[PDB]
Amino acid sequence: SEFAFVKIASDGKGFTRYGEPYLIRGANYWQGMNLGADDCSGGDRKRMELEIKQMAEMGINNLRVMASSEGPDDQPYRMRPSMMPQPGKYNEGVFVGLDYLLDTMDRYNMTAVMTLGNFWQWSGGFGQYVAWITGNQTIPYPVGDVTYDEFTQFAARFYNDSEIAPKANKLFKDHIYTVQNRRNTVNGKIYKEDPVIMSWQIANEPQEAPASWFEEISTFIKKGAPKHLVSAGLESKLDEYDFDRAHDHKNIDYTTCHCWVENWGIYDPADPDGLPHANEYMHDFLESRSKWAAQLNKPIVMEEFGMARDAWRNPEDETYKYLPSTPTSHKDEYYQKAFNQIVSLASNRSFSGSNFWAYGGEGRSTYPPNPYGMVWLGDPPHEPHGWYSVYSNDTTVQIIKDYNANLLKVQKELSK
Numbered sequence: 001s002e003f004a005f006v007k008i009a010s011d012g013k014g015f016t017r018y019g020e021p022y023l024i025r026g027a028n029y030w031q032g033m034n035l036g037a038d039d040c041s042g043g044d045r046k047r048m049e050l051e052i053k054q055m056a057e058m059g060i061n062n063l064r065v066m067a068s069s070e071g072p073d074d075q076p077y078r079m080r081p082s083m084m085p086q087p088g089k090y091n092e093g094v095f096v097g098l099d100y101l102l103d104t105m106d107r108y109n110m111t112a113v114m115t116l117g118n119f120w121q122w123s124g125g126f127g128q129y130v131a132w133i134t135g136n137q138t139i140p141y142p143v144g145d146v147t148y149d150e151f152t153q154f155a156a157r158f159y160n161d162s163e164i165a166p167k168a169n170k171l172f173k174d175h176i177y178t179v180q181n182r183r184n185t186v187n188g189k190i191y192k193e194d195p196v197i198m199s200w201q202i203a204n205e206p207q208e209a210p211a212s213w214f215e216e217i218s219t220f221i222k223k224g225a226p227k228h229l230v231s232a233g234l235e236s237k238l239d240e241y242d243f244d245r246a247h248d249h250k251n252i253d254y255t256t257c258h259c260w261v262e263n264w265g266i267y268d269p270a271d272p273d274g275l276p277h278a279n280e281y282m283h284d285f286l287e288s289r290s291k292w293a294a295q296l297n298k299p300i301v302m303e304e305f306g307m308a309r310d311a312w313r314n315p316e317d318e319t320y321k322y323l324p325s326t327p328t329s330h331k332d333e334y335y336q337k338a339f340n341q342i343v344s345l346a347s348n349r350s351f352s353g354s355n356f357w358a359y360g361g362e363g364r365s366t367y368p369p370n371p372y373g374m375v376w377l378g379d380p381p382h383e384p385h386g387w388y389s390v391y392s393n394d395t396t397v398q399i400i401k402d403y404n405a406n407l408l409k410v411q412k413e414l415s416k
Helices: 032-036 045-057 092-107 125-134 148-160 164-180 211-224 240-247 275-296 329-347 396-415
Strands: 015-017 020-022 024-028 062-066 111-115 197-201 229-231 255-259 300-305 353-356 359-361
Touching (some): 024 396, 032 045, 032 062, 045 359, 062 353, 125 148, 125 164, 148 164, 164 211, 211 240, 240 255, 255 275, 275 300, 300 329, 329 396
Parallel strands (some): 024 062, 062 111, 111 197, 197 229, 255 300, 300 353
16 A cells, blocks of 8 residues: 555665656755645645646656745745744645645646755744744844854754754654644645655755754654655765765665755856856766765765856846846756766666756746745745746756656666
């Protein structure tokens, strides 16, 4: 009765589903829950349904989605309305959006990676849990003079502070229990029994969290939903020690990496000559991270990566970088080369696929905010609208479609 659940191959070198290898023809669609919500809760469910259909037509079989968001709903830089405006109090309209997301994915034979939390601020995240515990809602968001380091030390108290961490983790476990035990109001499935869910993912991008926290939370999640895979959500941006600290645990079933050349200072999209160094970085990142995963004998998915539009065509105009009319020639080549490497690595069972960040669909960065202040698309509200989104008619779509066809062909060869 568990034929449809995604599993780790008994030899550790990939996933299976339906008794056959399973490769990840993936996308990120973290805005799905909010778009699936009814109109009064800020959704656009027909648009969600169309964007899922578009992704199915481009060959996608797997969406990494966000199954959390924290209030209060008067905070900048985050999804609104939140799923969980106060601890243990839910916005049912937004929760129903997650039910519709999962039901629509089921109709298109997709599986979901269910991200249960977020280090970062765009869904409230670990800094919001810290604010709840300390009783101080003034979170030092990393804008103006506030460093990404200052914010990180604030939010990392979630797992590093001896007083705060037990309290924060209690509230987080309460959320995990509530999502794992949700009855889908649309199709009646309890989430922890739904084979549309591929995995429960601890959180997006924990920052140097201790091994003991990964051990404890992964075991909690696995005991809560014993039929499902568990993932750590790591970037794998540092060294092998950091990789092992997150992944070398019985209840972490597979490994991830997130590759962000502009964010890490490797690529300047305003530099007409900057692409070769980004392509070489991506190449070496895939090679090295594939080897780290092999050392643990677990699969690996590059569950985030992306690149800006062609800012270099008009480098003096900041707004030009984010217009949907701006071409994506660097991005398309970057995606195409990463994809072709992944297909070759997957052919030897050294990589399991990828989820580009992120599908924008019908949203556009030039459109007005909805009444909650949201311009929904693939870029969360802590970043410029349109930075990394792949729109429904971008030139990148055909490259994604061809990649997914190539990875499915590989999956079939591996099934013989």
